[PDB]
Ligand binder design. Structure first.
Ligand SMILES: CC(C)(C)c1cc(C(C)(C)C)c(O)c([C@@](O)(C(=O)O)C(F)(F)F)c1
Length: 133
């Protein structure tokens, strides 16, 4: 029953500061413009110890599967090759991506009927709000 409140299909309903987050990460102009326009769904499922997170949009369809605390290699939607570890910290899914001596953290949390995603790169934070589809 790890992660029960995250499981389901979620749709993006608001975004703040996402372009600036992407700039800080190093995403190029054209990808920022097209990715920033995306209205993704996020589909989260659990089977045993394996969590799967899919992101589906007109820009890209991506999927990660992982076990909490166990590092994995990820190719991000902007084509970074990163080493990722996802843990549960006080009910928050904390996703750390490492590449080229850099690091970014993406947190997913349940707040009321929303799934709130906070993306941090150095001092820049983007907040993305999803609701059930
Ligand atoms: C949906 C899409 C492809 C625009 C997208 C692209 C990225 C980048 C480019 C890797 C920064 C990203 O981080 C996120 C996400 O962080 C968000 O919604 O905030 C995630 F992962 F939660 F879906 C979405």
């Amino acid at each position: 029953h790890m992660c029960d409140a995250f499981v389901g299909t979620w749709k993006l309903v608001s975004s703040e500061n996402f372009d600036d987050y992407m700039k800080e990460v190093g995403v190029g102009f054209a990808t920022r413009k097209v990715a920033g326009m995306a209205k993704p769904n996020m589909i989260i499922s659990v089977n045993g110890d394996v969590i799967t997170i899919k992101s589906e949009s007109t820009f890209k369809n991506t999927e990660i599967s992982f076990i909490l605390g166990q590092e994995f290699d990820e190719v991000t939607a902007d084509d970074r090759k990163v080493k990722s570890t996802i843990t549960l910290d006080g009910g928050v899914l904390v996703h750390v991506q490492k590449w080229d001596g850099k690091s970014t953290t993406i947190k997913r949390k349940r707040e009321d009927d929303k799934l709130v995603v906070e993306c941090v790169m150095k001092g820049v934070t983007s907040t993305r709000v999803y609701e059930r589809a």
